[PDB]
């Protein structure tokens, strides 16, 4: 039990939900959020793809370590850091790393709504309905304190404003007046 763990100077933002990544509903809903942040925080942000499985801290140990070091480095000058991390679907996945993410839950409150959204993507996505529904139910069972931000707004612009307000406040917390 050491008293301090070294973590990035800016906590990396990670998006989880509304279901599993690698399927269209989740990938497209998260994509719209990444694109918003890119312009909303232009000049103060870096958004980077993380393909290596950083929950392992498959991907080799060296590949994981170098991605972890890269994320620390991106945050060194106190710019916002946002990860598009393919393998991360649950907050408990990074709990044993020293990344200390800001975990953003993109939450669809109604399972019926998620099912209809998946079906709207066509049978190629609806084939994988159950695995997506099971994953969303698991996020929904987590205590809310496992998440730093919960975006349960049904309009993109409202979800974006909520996330932006949170990150703008994080910017202030990390950038005290001179």
């Amino acid at each position: 039990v050491p008293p301090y763990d070294v973590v990035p100077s800016m906590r990396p933002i990670i998006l989880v939900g509304p279901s599993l990544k690698g399927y269209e509903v989740t990938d497209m809903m998260q994509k719209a959020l990444f694109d918003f942040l890119k312009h909303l925080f232009d000049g103060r942000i870096s958004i980077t793809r993380v393909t290596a499985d950083i929950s392992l801290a498959r991907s080799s140990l060296a590949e994981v370590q170098s991605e972890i070091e890269r994320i620390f480095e991106l945050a060194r000058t106190l710019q916002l850091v946002a990860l598009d991390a393919d393998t991360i679907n649950h907050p408990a996945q990074l709990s044993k790393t020293s990344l200390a993410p800001i975990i953003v839950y993109i939450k669809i409150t109604s399972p019926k709504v998620l099912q209809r959204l998946i079906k709207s993507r066509g049978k190629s996505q609806s084939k994988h309905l159950n695995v997506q529904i099971a994953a969303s139910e698991k996020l929904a069972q987590c205590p809310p304190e496992m998440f730093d931000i919960i975006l349960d707004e049904n309009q993109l612009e409202d979800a974006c404003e909520h996330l932006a307000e949170y990150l703008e406040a994080y910017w202030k917390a990390t950038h005290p007046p001179s």
Binding site: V113, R116, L117, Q155, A159
Partner: peptide, 20 residues
């Protein structure tokens, strides 16, 4: 009608991510 409210809204969440 709350379910009809979200389902159109989230689908525009889908729609304005595709053309970008």
């Amino acid at each position: 009608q709350q379910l009809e409210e979200d389902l159109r809204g989230y689908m525009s969440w889908i729609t304005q991510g595709e053309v970008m």
